[PDB]
Amino acid sequence: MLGFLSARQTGLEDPLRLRRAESTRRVLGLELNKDRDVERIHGGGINTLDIEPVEGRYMLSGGSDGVIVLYDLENSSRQSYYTCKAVCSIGRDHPDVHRYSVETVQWYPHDTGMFTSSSFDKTLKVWDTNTLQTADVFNFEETVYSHHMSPVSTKHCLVAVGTRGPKVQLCDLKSGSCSHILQGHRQEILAVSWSPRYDYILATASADSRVKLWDVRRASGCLITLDQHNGKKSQAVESANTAHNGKVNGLCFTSDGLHLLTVGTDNRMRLWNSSNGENTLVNYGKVCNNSKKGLKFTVSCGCSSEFVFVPYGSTIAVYTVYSGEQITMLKGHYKTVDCCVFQSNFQELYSGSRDCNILAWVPSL
Amino acid sequence: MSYNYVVTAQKPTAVNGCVTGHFTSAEDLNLLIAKNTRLEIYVVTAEGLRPVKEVGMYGKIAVMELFRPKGESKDLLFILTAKYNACILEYKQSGESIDIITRAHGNVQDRIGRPSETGIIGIIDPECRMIGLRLYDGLFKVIPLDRDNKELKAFNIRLEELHVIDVKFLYGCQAPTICFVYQDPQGRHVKTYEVSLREKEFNKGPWKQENVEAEASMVIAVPEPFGGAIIIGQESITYHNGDKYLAIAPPIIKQSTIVCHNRVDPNGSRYLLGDMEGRLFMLLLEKEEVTLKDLRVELLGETSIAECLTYLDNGVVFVGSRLGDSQLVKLNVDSNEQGSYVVAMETFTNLGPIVDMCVVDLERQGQGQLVTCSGAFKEGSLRIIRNGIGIHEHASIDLPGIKGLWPLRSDPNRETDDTLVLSFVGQTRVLMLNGEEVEETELMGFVDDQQTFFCGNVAHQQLIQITSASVRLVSQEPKALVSEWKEPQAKNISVASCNSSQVVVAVGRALYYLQIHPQELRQISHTEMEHEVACLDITPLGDSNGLSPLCAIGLWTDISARILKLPSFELLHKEMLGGEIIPRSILMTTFESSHYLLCALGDGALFYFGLNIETGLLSDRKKVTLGTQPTVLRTFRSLSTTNVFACSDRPTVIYSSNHKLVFSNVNLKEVNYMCPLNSDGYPDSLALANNSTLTIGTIDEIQKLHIRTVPLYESPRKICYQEVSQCFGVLSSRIEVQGTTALRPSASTQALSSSVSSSKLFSEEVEVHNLLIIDQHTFEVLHAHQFLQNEYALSLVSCKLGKDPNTYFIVGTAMVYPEEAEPKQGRIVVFQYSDGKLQTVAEKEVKGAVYSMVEFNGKLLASINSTVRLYEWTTEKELRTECNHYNNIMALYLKTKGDFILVGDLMRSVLLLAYKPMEGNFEEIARDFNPNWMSAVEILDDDNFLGAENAFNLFVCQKDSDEERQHLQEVGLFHLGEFVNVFCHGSLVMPTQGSVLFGTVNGMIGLVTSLSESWYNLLLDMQNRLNKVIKSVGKIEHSFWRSFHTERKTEPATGFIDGDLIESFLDISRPKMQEVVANATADDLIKVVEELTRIH
Amino acid sequence: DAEFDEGFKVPGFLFKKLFKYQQTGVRWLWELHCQQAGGILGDEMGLGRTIQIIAFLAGLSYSKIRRFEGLGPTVIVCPTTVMHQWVKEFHTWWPPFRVAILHETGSYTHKKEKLIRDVAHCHGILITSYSYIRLMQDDISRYDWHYVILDEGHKIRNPNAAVTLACKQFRTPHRIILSGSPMQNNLRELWSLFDFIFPGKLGTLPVFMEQFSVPITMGGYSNASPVQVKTAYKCACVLRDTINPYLLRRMK
DNA sequence: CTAGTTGATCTCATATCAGGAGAAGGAGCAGAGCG
Description:
This is part of a larger assembly, with chains A, B and C.
Chain A: H1 2-10, H2 15-28, E1 30-32, E2 36-38, E3 46-51, E4 58-63, E5 68-72, E6 82-84, E7 86-90, E8 102-107, E9 114-119, E10 123-128, E11 133-139, E12 144-149, E13 158-163, E14 168-172, E15 181-182, E16 189-194, E17 201-206, E18 211-215, E19 224-225, E20 248-253, E21 259-264, E22 268-273, E23 298-299, E24 307-312, E25 315-320, E26 326-330, E27 337-343, E28 348-353, E29 358-363
Parallel strand pairs in A: 2-6
Antiparallel strand pairs in A: 1-29, 3-4, 4-5, 5-7, 8-9, 9-10, 10-11, 12-13, 13-14, 14-15, 16-17, 17-18, 18-19, 20-21, 21-22, 23-24, 24-25, 25-26, 27-28, 28-29
Chain B: E1 4-10, E2 15-21, E3 30-35, E4 38-44, E5 49-56, E6 61-67, E7 76-81, E8 85-94, E9 97-107, E10 121-124, E11 130-134, E12 139-144, E13 155-158, E14 164-169, E15 177-184, E16 187-196, E17 201-204, E18 210-211, E19 218-221, E20 229-232, E21 237-240, E22 245-248, E23 258-263, E24 270-275, E25 279-288, E26 291-302, E27 308-313, E28 316-320, E29 326-331, E30 342-348, E31 356-360, E32 369-374, E33 381-386, E34 393-395, E35 405-408, E36 419-423, E37 428-431, E38 452-458, E39 462-467, E40 470-473, E41 483-486, E42 502-507, E43 510-517, E44 520-528, E45 533-537, E46 550-555, E47 560-565, E48 570-576, E49 583-590, E50 595-601, E51 605-611, E52 619-625, E53 632-637, E54 642-647, E55 652-657, E56 660-665, E57 676-677, E58 685-686, E59 688-689, E60 694-697, E61 706-711, E62 715-722, E63 727-736, E64 753-756, E65 766-775, E66 781-786, E67 791-799, E68 808-815, E69 826-834, E70 837-842, E71 845-846, E72 852-856, E73 859-864, E74 867-873, E75 879-885, E76 891-897, E77 900-905, E78 911-916, E79 921-927, E80 934-941, ...
Parallel strand pairs in B: 1-89, 64-66
Antiparallel strand pairs in B: 1-86, 2-3, 3-4, 4-5, 6-7, 7-8, 8-9, 10-11, 11-12, 12-13, 14-15, 15-16, 16-17, 16-18, 19-20, 20-21, 21-22, 23-24, 24-25, 25-26, 27-28, 28-29, 29-30, 31-32, 32-33, 33-61, 34-60, 35-36, 36-37, 38-39, 39-40, 40-41, 42-43, 43-44, 45-46, 46-47, 47-48, 49-50, 50-51, 51-52, ...
Chain C: H1 12-15, H2 20-35, E1 39-41, H3 50-62, E2 74-77, H4 80-93, E3 99-101, H5 112-121, E4 125-128, H6 130-135, E5 147-151, H7 162-167, E6 175-178, H8 187-197, H9 205-218, H10 226-243, E7 247-248
Parallel strand pairs in C: 1-6, 1-7, 2-4, 2-5, 3-4, 5-6
Helix pairs in contact in C: 2-3, 3-4, 8-9, 9-10
Chain C binds one DNA strand through residues 130-131, 134, 155, 157-158, 160-163, 185.
GO molecular function (chain A): ubiquitin-like ligase-substrate adaptor activity
Organism (chain A): Homo sapiens
Pfam families (chain A): WD40 (PF00400)
């Protein structure tokens, strides 16, 4: 570290070197901080967490009990020990509270004033953070497994919604049109994720073992359908070209958006070229998931080497994205982990689980 | 909101990139040097370099390459900025006017992307079919050139290799072919692609991938005859052409890796290679009839540590250094008897990485004087920076009450000024000053009972003296006075004037014109004017015949600089000056373009006009107020041109550079009179008379801040000044290899006395760290205390602790072992410098690296790894902890004002801490919760905190105005473009509040100071309008350039005035000024901008 | 020559002949082509819509934008009474298009499948009737058509008719409708037309009905409760803005 | 071979108490092992 400081100070190395290297070192040293706690408010398992993209100060959390909690992640107290207090909460007494499990919650990108949340009550509610009141509701004919707003699109403000229907619903928060559907999957869509690189590229993963990339502008079906073998087992596309040998219940684009991570109930995680959907054949070993719903996992940002923090049973398994090497397994939960979210400002991780806890993992030293 | 003004006191000096080519003309050979934000254009003359232009980009030049598209007469320049502004620039010379026209521009930043490790690579196809940019991992951006854009539309090609080390375009390829080294987990490989602009994708390269060395880090494209590429690695140099595979492993290059290269020939039969040690190798390609036989490497010699190097011609090489002075070296065919062919021709001063610096009032004036820890491993040095011109006195003679100075050649044969005549009250005193010996003697032909208004050497090997009563023409060779003229009415002479040929004396209100001829003083022109005389000058300029045709006068009660026709004493021109103070000095001098008349008053006012040799008409009146006392003007011809000197309580050397007059300061107390002097021992020397003595000094550079250099030959890290001990404490670091052996004689090894740390606390190449005590007069290393094995000295403070009166050098260290990443051991050592020795007064084992130490109200405030703790200095002379604060990731930077501590963190950015003495512990007042990685911090006022973030930004935090009081508000934001290493209060000079200098990695010394709300609004408006009028080189918007920028944030600047942009308000023509100041008058804004320029 | 943002060189000696609204329409057609979506030139009769189409396709062919080097094989489905008019329009605006009519009158004098094969093999401009689409729905849709233009596309007004199914069996993303009135009776027709040009935008027909047609007509009666009319207005607004970037309609 | 006319054929619109007997399932529940 003193070598790094000296090399930054004298200009041998770009300051970029020290940032990325020290962030990587912090991530490798990621450990359950009993020096930080998250206030327990959910009566049920936390299905989803979302740190706001701008300023990374506030975090949303949706539980199976239907409540939403809005936490402050900044140590506003002068002590080195603090609890991430719950700022707001859509509780059992809020008139608009979800009737059933909140499966996904997402801050509006570009501003912290709005956030959207979907539930097994077949609703995607848009909330005004300041008033804490719903500003819009999108009813769907079938329960929502996942929704996602594009983190990049300054132009369109569509929400891709995956429900048990075989169709992917696109809901325009700009004047409200929830009619658009992308057809081509054959079973429930368990995950949707917009590319962080291209405004209109959407990757949708479903129960039929397929992941499809769509250009929602385009009127002609999916761009690419991810294939495990890239052509070794080639068939007229009616049943082949599966991304996994089971249900694909998780999606995540890498930070730069040039690759796609999909995790499926075949206990595999695969990395795909997001442009031509080619399997990069990164191994990753065996990534244990048996989730019957969407599995929310994240990648690191702004480190020398990219990581992926994937829920592995009751632990969080940390892998290197481009080599597969399992860095470590963060072990602090008591039931299966549903979601982990990465605070890229400080290389911190927050993981929620069915044990009704949100555990913060902070780098040690 | 905070209101700050940032200006550049010293422009960046570190050369981050240099190219050669035909840019200014098809026939010229130019050397273009990129210093961080400056582009310097030179011409490669037969000797040295002739500067032609120096332009400022609104961007850090990351890439800079010259290329000649088909049909173009001369090379165009492609520059990419760190913020990814691309531009193609052309050089257009229209007579005197010079322009750098932007043939094209754009911004090529992708909205997201991991900026690559090795950094922005920008390459051009040798057939100029495209520009390749490697900006992000997994992508390769292309700017087509055959399609003549003006917006530089660029498209990404996905590169399946994600860790690219280096990339070049290959030569002799039908289609654009890139060759790149990339790292995959299986090792490093060289691969090629063909870039298809029509299909906009990569294709199979001409020759398949090859597995190469583990540290293969550079690719060299070889021109057409050989083709292929040479990949330089840590241990080997290999060549690939697709079927041929040469490889060499010269042992001489194993010690250090080669970091830069340059093609000496057009056919690439020879390449220069520079390594991090500064060695310069020559890589030779031996051809066969053509194919390539073998590779050879020969060590040419040693240079500065090269960031880049360029071969100009005739064996002349420019060694551009970021870490040391850039060099201009020659390559001789034969060695110099020490094995080296390199011979340094010229050196360009580089304030290298200014890792630390202090403002010290050396020589006990009222002027600050920066001392900086500049440079790095071999190029380390202390640079001493001062304003002014430099007295450089050599001798003095205590002669109270001087009222005149004139140089004389007493020896007839010698043309040198080996005698000085002086007037004090009513008599004449002569001084011989033979060589260096000075004594007081009398020279024949001078009256010692009457005052000397004037005297000097004249033609015909004659001297002349104008006294208060008569004028005496001394025949130096034959005998004493033979021609003497006395006023017919025996009236006294009030003012005098004379040159090498003629004379003009003022008696009362009347002027007499005398012409000097052998054994004759003939009066021609005479008149009795309206009022009394004040000052005169008849010095010939552009003489060419022997006589001046004009005259300049100053009169009484009609205060004005008047002109006269010499043969007739008629009134040519009149300019009215006014005031109740008579003129004192009138001088006329050529300044680089034409004749100027310099007239001064008794209150320090001075007027300079443009004079014509035909009419004698004063035009383009401009006024300048220098000094608060009367002034006299004296002319001395330096190396370049004539440089008039203004003598007053505020001495100021006046000359002209770039056809504009500038007022450079002289920083001694006072100068009544001056005269030039070139004795056999004193060359081009001065003789500055004051009330007491005559200091005899020369002046070096008469223009900008002067930089001394004290070569340390080892990396300095910190520096603090001990006034009581008259020395600088400098932490230094040298590299030893083996027990251990110094690679060269460094400053630590060459101290007068020395010592080594003998501590009972703790029981390839390594860094040895020393504490150097350096004399603040001679800058010799009085002492060098070497620290423990594997001990890195990080911080150093000079202070008094507790109650005892001794001043200590206190050092914080850390124990660095290779098996660990963050030191767990370290110590605070207290030294006392006395009797030329450095005794160890105390020690204190801490459990971490002591990154930073500041004295805090008689207590020692250290920053051990993540804790900021306060120590008390007990009567027993040991350090005892008082209080701690632990809520830091890594408290790297500490500053103080009163009871408040500003803790700069590695990544949580600032923390306002207060030591509440009543309770005896720290209290977190406020914190900035943004994730800014600090490089330095500073406290401007009680509640404004300057900080430097590592992405080259400045921000100011402010204590706000409940729990939101613990949130520091970023009220100022500004992208400096520099990595600030150190802030320090002080100013380099004798409207703005406070003054903070800062030094950067690239060698910029900048200055931050606080403005008031009124001036801030005014200057911000000026800034907006100047942006509307000034045209940038790459057509980059100033607002975009100065926008706070980080990988996860981008906001416009605020609370900061770009002082460089404001001070450019003077370098524009008058109509443009009127365009700026449309909606008070322009001269008001001129007054403002000068008053702003005075602060640095 | 007039130039668009990404680069679509509509020739000057054609582009100058168009009127302002016609040039706006060519712009819009090409915005769709970039988005790879279809749309409805709903301009009512007499403005001239065939001119805009020939203009745009000619610009797309000359500009050589690319799949296909420039414009590929295109099929135009129009009523019999206007086919010959269409070919004349092409031949007077952009001659180099090898335009060919599929009809008993025709000009091929050989097997009609050989006409389809030849025209597709030459990237020609093939004109049919709706009946030939319906009859040869399996044969005509095998040659990778690059454009489908249903002139008077209100023949597709019924989502049940065999002509609608046969026309929706085309695969290309590029579907253009030239109809003076996209809907004539009710919103069945609008949905069918949009299901053609852009298969997914409006939902499946049940969803579209139950969201739009019923609330809307219930709000079209003067005895409707205030809530009903207010909901009708809201749903009409939602549909209007949903169809906005794909229906270009200009009145007189 | 070449048009043109004339039938047939098909597609697409526009309508709002005086049974009985047995077989199967299910539910209540007593009770016996037995984990």
